[PDB]
Amino acid sequence: DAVRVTSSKLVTQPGTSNPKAVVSFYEDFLCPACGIFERGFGPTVSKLVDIGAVAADYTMVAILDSASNQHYSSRAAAAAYCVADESIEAFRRFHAALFSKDIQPAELGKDFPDNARLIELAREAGVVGKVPDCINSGKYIEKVDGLAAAVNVHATPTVRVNGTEYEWSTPAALVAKIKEIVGDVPGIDSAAATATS
Q: Which CATH fold would you assign to the domain 1-197?
């Protein structure tokens, strides 16, 4: 249901493979607040992933999907899952790209990327593989369309920390929360520096 992003440095619960800290993001690719939120928190989260402070769970839901936007939300989420299938790193780059200012369509706009453009963005993210057919076949469409109800999240962006609702403010606040959970890990202060710019 979520794409789990980690690195080889992941800090785990003693005697298990399970992350000590999991930050679950629930996003819609057409959600403007989500664009702002990801452009703001992204580098910090990526750093926290790299130093192994957290695992980052991404659930891309369909809640904004409509015929008016040409089902952009659902096609984009499905596409993202397709990419994650091939590569996790490719997913990081893809996910980041879709939320960049030059890319994310304006909700309520008349212009939205078709599947060919999503495919091309996947290529730029570093993967081809089965992704083109995974996207063209609409493999994940029904999945993503059901995700919102599945995980029971109807608002975006929504963030949870170890399954608990988390009201986010700044990247710094988040870094501090994670530090509260995992203690002082190598790099986490560096991550705070990333959070404050």
A: Glutaredoxin (3.40.30)
